[PDB]
Write a protein that binds this ligand. Structure first.
Ligand code: 8FN
Ligand code: 8FN
Ligand code: NI
Ligand code: NI
Length: 129
């Protein structure tokens, strides 16, 4: 099957102007809140295709994503905008639905934590200032 993509973030391609700290603190706390959701447990760590016996996972999913990667990218200043945090969360969810199917129980878990994430993000402070 397709090989495992490199871990994010690319430490040689970090942005010159990352998310401002007041937004970075908020999205970090937002991800940590989602990580405490019981529905988030299977999303805490990258898919391990050996443990799960899916040799063709990366053929479906060329850009895997998980909550720990989002947290790491926030901490390592890899994001330029909070829209990219939203994008990565949506990518994690879309990956799950693409590989497992929309009707799978794991995809309902993904939808549930996406709904929590979206509700929490209502209160993100604006970028300017
Ligand atoms: O995409 C998948 C995926 C990919 C291939 C096959 C199934 C799944 S579903 C899935 C399950 C897990 C998992 N972690 O632990 C256990 C477990 C299961 N029973 C007993 C003990 N532990 N399952 C982690 C990630 C995960 N995800 C990612 C969308 C989350
Ligand atoms: O038989 C199966 C089985 C049944 C159906 C589909 C796949 C598998 S393979 C399999 C994986 C898991 C699992 N535990 O943690 C994770 C994980 C994966 N990535 C990230 C984080 N965590 N996967 C547990 C039990 C397990 N087993 C039992 C033989 C062990
Ligand atoms: Ni292979
Ligand atoms: Ni704004």
């Amino acid at each position: 099957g397709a090989p495992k993509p490199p871990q994010e973030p690319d430490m040689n391609n970090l942005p010159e102007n990352p998310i401002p700290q007041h937004q970075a603190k908020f999205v970090l706390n937002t991800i940590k809140a989602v990580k405490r959701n019981r529905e988030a447990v299977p999303f805490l760590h990258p898919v391990d295709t050996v443990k799960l016996n899916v040799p063709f996972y990366y053929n479906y999913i060329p850009r895997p994503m998980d909550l720990s990667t989002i947290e790491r990218k926030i901490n390592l200043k890899a994001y330029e905008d909070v829209s990219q945090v939203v994008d990565d969360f949506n990518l994690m969810v879309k990956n799950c639905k693409k590989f497992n199917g929309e009707a799978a129980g794991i995809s309902k878990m993904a939808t549930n934590i996406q709904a929590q994430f979206e509700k929490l993000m209502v209160k993100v402070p604006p970028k300017e200032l």
